[PDB]
Paper text:
EGFR is a 170 kDa type I transmembrane receptor composed of an extracellular region characterized by four domains (I, II, III and IV), a transmembrane region, and an intracellular region composed of a kinase domain and a C-terminal tail. Ligand binding to the EGFR ectodomain is coupled to both homo- and heterodimerization, which is followed by conformational rearrangements of the transmembrane region and asymmetric dimerization of the intracellular kinase domains, one of which phosphorylates the other to initiate signaling. The EgB4 nanobody, selected from the VHH library directed against EGFR for its non-agonistic and non-antagonistic properties, was proposed to bind to EGFR domain I while not competing with EGF binding, but no structural information is available on EgB4 or its interaction with EGFR. Here we report crystal structures of the EgB4 nanobody, alone (up to 1.48 Å resolution) and in complex with the full extracellular region of EGF-bound EGFR (up to 6.0 Å resolution).
The structure shows a heart-shaped receptor-mediated dimer, on top of which EgB4 engages domains I and II, resulting in a physiological 2:2:2 complex. The structure of the EGFR-EGF part of the EGFR-EgB4-EGF complex resembles closely the previously determined EGFR-EGF complex. This indicates that the EGFR-EGF complex is in a physiologically active conformation when bound to EgB4, and that EgB4 binding does not induce large conformational changes in the EGF-bound EGFR. The CDR2 and CDR3 of EgB4 interact with the top of EGFR domain I, and CDR3 also interacts with residues at the domain I-II junction, together forming a buried surface area of 1403 Å2. While sidechains are not resolved in the electron density of the 6 Å complex their location can be inferred from the correct positioning of the higher-resolution individual structures in the data. Specifically, a hydrophobic core is formed by the sidechains of Trp140 and Phe156 from the top of EGFR domain I, and by that of tryptophan residues in EgB4 CDR2 (Trp53) and CDR3 (Trp100). Within the same region, the sidechain of EGFR Arg141 forms salt bridges with asparagine residues from EgB4 CDR3 (Asp98 and Asp110). The CDR3 Arg105 sidechain forms additional hydrogen bonding interactions with the backbone carbonyl groups of Lys188, Ile189 and Cys191 at the EGFR domain I-II junction, extending the EGFR-EgB4 interface towards EGFR domain II. The structure of the EgB4-binding site in the active EGFR resembles closely that of the inactive EGFR, suggesting there is no interface rearrangement within EGFR in the transition from the inactive, closed conformation to the active ligand-bound conformation.
Numbering used by the authors:
A (entry chain B), F (entry chain B): 1 to 130
B (entry chain A), D (entry chain A): 1 to 614
C (entry chain C), E (entry chain C): 5 to 51
Write the structure that this text describes.
């Protein structure tokens, strides 16, 4: 029943490091589980990561071990450390939240942030991911 | 076990029955070894300890659940799986969990309801749960239906902070309690887009049928854990296949072997006897305004009623008198010409003395006559008060049958207790289709335990509990036993008109020894152990019987004139002749009738022209 | 401890009791009499 | 396009209409631009070439298909998708492909029916297909339903061996023809265990709804390519949600917005006017033995009939007279007291002359009286013969309405052709609920094109085709036009009794100029443009009108005696008095009636004692 | 060419014809008359 | 509508070669598609291979490139060359047939051969498959 907003979306070199954030616009932040979703341009919107309102983390396999979602109750914010970035990461990223669920289905989160573009440079500039 | 053993359940909400132990014990008695709860689970006033082992066996509840003012530590409702919740707590929530604490900061702590995974309807309430632990971690969306999450107002205020910590391996730190078993079992959220309904796992194979409630053990329609709408044996159906399939080809109806009757949540081939069978093919309980109960070869059918209808007078606590919780001066007005009572009858004390709170006038003892119109009752009857003026139950003289499809606590079709009445005086009551009879707490009521109930009961399981009524020791001394004329089968009072079955014969409703054949004022005949009065034309015979039938055709001798066995007042004038031509006959000294001569216009006093001078 | 509005509402020896939980009122019926106005008799046991 | 444009289809089987071209052309005319075939696809006698482009557009067929004796090379039925096949070829197969060859070993060669992927019912037949190629490779199990594979008797005898070779990439060398497009499209075999019904692909997501026929474009119930049972708009349903849902809780019925009417394969909210609406909630065509057609506020309803029923006499070629293909001497017997004709009426020539083959006696012209009982016909009427004896259609004097729910070729409710009759003489026929009227081929039938049909038609699309009937040029010369008394609206014959509507007034059924008010034998009154005869009591008046009503209450003057305006035969004797006591009155010279004195038993000839000597 | 059994079965100038395919018999109706016994008149065209 | 019968089931060294056969007991053999199925002991019955009545071959991926199903219309028989055998092959082998289908579903073949045991020796005796 509260709004959201992202920050940190931009461009980076293939294989770089970045730090995204998702700030909750309202109250009772601690009560809301937080989730990140991405949509590759010209594709369908897909799941990225989540963390329950009971502080239980859960990753999608693609980003698993390269991404670290987190949340700060005091500041009503969430974070996402992203290392060993891949050109495949380039997408439009959103963050959703919900009090009564910590699932992975895009349908179960009905309060949404507005999102930001995240880009990782082409293979040319960087190296071939590991 | 084919069916699960049921307990009736209570709607009393916050009514404390005496002390905490007393209420706790009423609960224990009710819900002991209960598998499926018909009513509501009112866990109120459960104090420290009061071990609730027996509650574990409870699986589900049709109605809402109220857990309030329970300072108890452990409430093991582990096998509780689902709540249909057809009724809401204050039209709001399916589950109300409130004020589970004591003054000394000890409240509900452990609640390992690991199998509770579905709630069809209603919301949930949480507040004032200091001691509550583990339950906090429940991700409710899996359980509760999407429609209500806005109405859900819940809050975990773990002020104490003395709580357990979920076993790591639990799905994302959601656990009901300590141990691997108490990890929250979620079967909704992991159902991939494809699966609209419940599921076993993520693998698309595990799509359960839409018609499943708690989940499934496979895709087939029978494999549902709990049938959503109907439980046709193993299978879980939406609506019973109608009696006949509509034939697309011929645009006709073809008899369907699959055709069944929708009785509640069961597709069966046969209704309970008492229940009404529609041509539609569903076992129902009462006809609407459209029609009345047409007796169709010994089963009730709502055959359409042309023009004026008998109609149905909504019994108390149903339809148009649901507000009222006892027939009082107000509602009684609308019972002018009631033939079918579509509901119940609650006669409470407050009706007679009048209620200040509801501003209802005192029920006038004189107004008990209204009840004579009533002939049948679909449901049950409760009488907990009766005016001083009358001791006999005149009001129900013409009360015939109590259908009792709906019973008070699904157990009793009738209840008369704590009354001042002396004689039953129910002289038209000859059938109770179903439901038990309990007669108790009557100070000076004789005639109670004299009736042959086996005759009046038509269904398997109709019991009788008649206790604490005036002992025959006392009644017999003052001659309050079955009158000489009442058969031993049963008697409703000391009067000859209150006998169930008469010894020999009866004048109308009053039993008697033998009909007035030989002498006596009414010259009567004996038909079907009854004395009926001859037509006045039948001349009384001192020695011989007078007549053998109602009509004048069966008189032995005529009072005035005779025209054969058919005794007519006088020789017929204008009797049916040729194309309805008037026929003129003449009387004789011997009372014999013969035809006059055509000539005589003003009748004839003899044969031929010589009969009628002018 | 009940105000005048709700005082003398319950029958069959019912007594007004204050529901602190949500600031309501209710009746404390005697054993063997049930219902919010203590109107219904215990049917299954004790007559 | 909301609906697909339909063609009626034929059941003639091997009937060759003249030469090969003639039959081919009848076919072309019928099936040109046909989208869905209502009847049967009888591709017979298609010789060399005879290019069949127009057939490509055909999508499906309700009934069976017969491809026989077709020496043609190419039969492009590519867009043909499915065959419901509610009828079988000789109660055996849904498709019969036989003897497609010529003397010179040229037969059916190309048959790229790549989209034909389903057959609900029936088997298939193959034999004598020398030229047939490609089709051989079809793995039929995908298409045909499991129930029939035992009955399927098919064989590919490719004697010639001049055949094409499937494009490699086709699924396992199954192809309808050359090219990648003609590879056999299979949507059944690749449905993994989980998917019971049809599927798009192997991925478990692609499980189509069970209710789909040809396949689906997604799992949702609307996405079915072809609706199996019912096509409720996009959605494909099993049976229309009944009018009212059975309420599990209250055990009652609750009005259902989803409630619809099953009309054939469509869940609609409204039936076609003429069709019978049941309380069940399905549009039907006739009542069974249970009941008759009860008119219920201008719609037919099968309200239960008590005791004796009007019943329904199975029309020819239906039910108990399906064997018979024309009413003859035999079947006509069973038409004693027919009020409702549940079927059709076929009057063929062979009935009258008698059939050697079927051993049916000649229909006696005298036996045409039986038809007077018939009042209505559910279906249509066909008359292709009439006895020399009679020229007028007396038989149908009292034929009122032709419901025509079932029409011959779904187009015509009536057909009278090649007859010898001169006058129509149908003087009770006042409505044709639905169906077209075709009157043609009558040599000397006047009165044909005189009726105002717009009045008699009640439904949108009722056409009229009245051609090649006796020209008015000839009829008018011999005075075979609407009689003076028939209104211009229409007339059935030259007689005044055959007018549709009368100019001014009518004596019973025969139109006339003006009622006999002033003089004439029947003294009559004018009510609703009709003359009705006064009761005999009404004395005729030379100048004034005699009466103004049927009963004797409205006579101006009485024939004999007067007792007020109510003219009675004589002064009442025994008229209703006190508790049905006989009342004696006396006549007077002025025909006035007054009460006698009690004393006079034998009536009185004056007031008081002086009236009645003895 | 038809045996006596099936000879003279068809009406309205129908003629018996031998179905070589499966050893059956049928009628060859004239144009404008349809049905296996050539009984039904063409309704949609030519009267 | 005709019976079947297998031959060749037995024991072999890991990595060996074998030749199985399936003889049709009846007529119209050419009209029947032939399929091989296997069931690992204590497992469920699974698909192996098939060949249409239109002489179109089709393999399961496990055996693909190691197995060669075939059919001989003249002799009313079928064969299966099996090379580079794996201990995983040990199972009970059946051969089914059907005239009106050449599918892979065990349900679509309703005329069955009686089968034979086929065993491949344990890793100990042989080498580690490629
Ligand atoms: C429940 O009923 C059983 C019946 O045998 C009885 O023994 C038991 O004491 C009752 N109470 C509990 C808590 O089990
Ligand atoms: C529950 O514990 C209390 C202590 O507060 C004790 O008095 C009581 O006997 C116990 N009840 C039972 C049924 O053991
Ligand atoms: C929510 O509760 C309100 C009363 O608080 C009630 O009027 C309404 O019906 C409820 N809504 C739902 C969807 O249950
Ligand atoms: C009295 O009856 C009226 C009319 O039905 C009803 O509104 C009211 O609640 C009833 N009061 C009591 C105390 O039964
Ligand atoms: C119904 O009302 C009529 C009024 O015309 C009355 O005569 C009759 O006694 C009433 N019948 C019943 C059963 O109450
Ligand atoms: C009980 O009924 C009798 C009947 O006569 C009456 O005398 C007596 O007063 C009644 N008792 C009470 C307590 O009203
Ligand atoms: C009923 O008839 C029997 C037959 O003998 C008789 O003994 C008895 O007295 C009769 N009953 C009464 C109440 O008189
Ligand atoms: C079919 O109907 C159309 C209607 O315009 C007509 O032009 C055409 O000649 C007909 N025949 C064919 C084979 O299309
Ligand atoms: C089809 O080909 C034949 C050759 O046998 C030819 O006589 C005829 O004109 C062709 N038909 C059409 C409609 O072109
Ligand atoms: C198979 O055909 C026979 C006649 O040849 C028929 O009696 C039977 O109904 C058919 N069986 C099926 C399953 O269609
Ligand atoms: C004649 O009618 C009988 C009786 O319905 C029937 O069996 C027979 O097939 C009919 N024959 C013809 C030629 O209509
Ligand atoms: C039906 O039969 C009865 C025989 O009692 C006869 O009087 C009557 O005319 C018949 N009615 C019709 C409509 O055929
Ligand atoms: C046609 O009907 C008339 C009516 O009189 C009759 O004279 C004539 O013989 C009939 N024609 C034939 C060919 O039967
Ligand atoms: C019908 O009445 C009109 C009214 O004037 C009259 O002109 C006409 O002649 C009447 N019809 C006949 C057939 O006489």
């Amino acid at each position: 029943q509260v709004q959201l907003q992202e920050s940190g979306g931009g461009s980076v070199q293939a294989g770089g490091s970045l730090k995204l954030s998702c700030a909750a616009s309202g109250r009772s932040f601690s009560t809301y589980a937080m989730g990140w979703f991405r949509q590759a341009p010209g594709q369908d919107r897909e799941f990225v990561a989540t963390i329950s309102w009971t502080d239980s983390t859960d990753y999608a396999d693609s980003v698993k071990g390269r991404f670290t979602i987190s949340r700060d109750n005091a500041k009503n914010t969430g974070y996402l450390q992203m290392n060993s970035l891949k050109p495949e990461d380039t997408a439009v990223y959103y963050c959703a939240a919900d009090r009564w669920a910590s699932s992975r289905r895009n349908v179960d989160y009905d309060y949404w942030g507005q999102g930001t573009q995240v880009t990782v440079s082409s293979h040319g500039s960087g190296l071939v991911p590991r | 076990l084919e069916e699960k053993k049921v307990c009736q359940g209570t709607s009393n909400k916050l009514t404390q029955l005496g002390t905490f132990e007393d209420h706790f014990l009423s609960l224990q008695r009710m819900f002991n070894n209960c598998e499926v709860v018909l009513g509501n689970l009112e866990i109120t006033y459960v104090q420290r300890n009061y071990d609730l082992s027996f509650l574990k066996t409870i699986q589900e509840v049709a109605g809402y659940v109220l857990i309030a003012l329970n300072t108890v530590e452990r409430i093991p409702l582990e096998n509780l799986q689902i709540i249909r919740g057809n009724m809401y707590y204050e039209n709001s929530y399916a589950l109300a969990v409130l004020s589970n604490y004591d003054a000394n900061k000890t409240g509900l702590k452990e609640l390992p309801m690991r199998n509770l995974q579905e709630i069809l309807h209603g919301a949930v309430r949480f507040s004032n749960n200091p001691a509550l632990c583990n339950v906090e971690s429940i991700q409710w969306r899996d359980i509760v239906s999407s429609d209500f999450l806005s109405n859900m107002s819940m809050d975990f205020q773990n002020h104490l902070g003395s709580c357990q910590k979920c076993d790591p391996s639990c799905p994302n730190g959601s656990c009901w309690g300590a141990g691997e078993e108490n990890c929250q079992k979620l079967t909704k959220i992991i159902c991939a887009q494809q699966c609209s309904g419940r599921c076993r796992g993520k693998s698309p194979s595990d799509c359960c049928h839409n018609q499943c409630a708690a989940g499934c053990t496979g895709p087939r329609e029978s494999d549902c854990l709990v049938c959503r709408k109907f439980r046709d044996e193993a299978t879980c159906k939406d609506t019973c296949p109608p009696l006949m399939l509509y034939n697309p080809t011929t645009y006709q109806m073809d008899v369907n072997p699959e055709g069944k009757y929708s009785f509640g949540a069961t597709c069966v081939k046969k209704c309970p006897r008492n229940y009404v069978v529609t041509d539609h093919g569903s076992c129902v309980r009462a006809c609407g305004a459209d029609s009345y109960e047409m007796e169709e070869d010994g089963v009730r059918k709502c055959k359409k009623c042309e023009g004026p209808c008998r109609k149905v007078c909504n019994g108390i606590g149903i339809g148009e008198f649901k507000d009222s919780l006892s027939i009082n001066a107000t509602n009684i007005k609308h019972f002018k010409n009631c033939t079918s009572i579509s509901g119940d009858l609650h006669i409470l004390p407050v009706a007679f003395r009048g209620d200040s709170f509801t501003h209802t006038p005192p029920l006038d003892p004189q107004e008990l006559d209204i009840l004579k119109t009533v002939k049948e009752i679909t449901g049950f009857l409760l009488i907990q008060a009766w005016p001083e003026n009358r001791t006999d139950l005149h009001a129900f003289e013409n009360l015939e049958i109590i259908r009792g499809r709906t019973k008070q606590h699904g157990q009793f079709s009738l209840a008369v207790v704590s009354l001042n009445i002396t004689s039953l005086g129910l002289r038209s009551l000859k059938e109770i289709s179903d439901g038990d009879v309990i007669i108790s707490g009557n100070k000076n009521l004789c005639y109670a335990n004299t009736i042959n109930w086996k005759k009046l009961f038509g269904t398997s399981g109709q019991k009788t509990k008649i206790i604490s009524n005036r002992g025959e020791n006392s009644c017999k001394a003052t001659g309050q036993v079955c009158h000489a004329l009442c058969s031993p089968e049963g008697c409703w009072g000391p009067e000859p008109r209150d006998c169930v079955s008469c010894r020999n014969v009866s004048r109308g409703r009053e039993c008697v020894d033998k009909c007035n054949l030989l002498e006596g004022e009414p010259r009567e005949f004996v038909e079907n152990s009854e004395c009926i009065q001859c037509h006045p034309e039948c001349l009384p015979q001192a020695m011989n019987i007078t007549c053998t039938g109602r009509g004048p055709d069966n008189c032995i001798q005529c009072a005035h004139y005779i025209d054969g066995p058919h005794c007519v007042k006088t020789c017929p004038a204008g009797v049916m002749g040729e194309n309805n031509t008037l026929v003129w006959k003449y009387a004789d000294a011997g009372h014999v009738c013969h035809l006059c001569h055509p000539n005589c216009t003003y009748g004839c006093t003899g044969p031929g022209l010589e009969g009628c001078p002018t | 401890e009940c105000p005048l509005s709700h005082d003398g509402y319950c029958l069959h020896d019912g007594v007004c009791m204050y529901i602190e939980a949500l600031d309501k009122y209710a009746c404390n019926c005697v054993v063997g009499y049930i219902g919010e106005r203590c109107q219904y008799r215990d049917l299954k046991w004790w007559e």
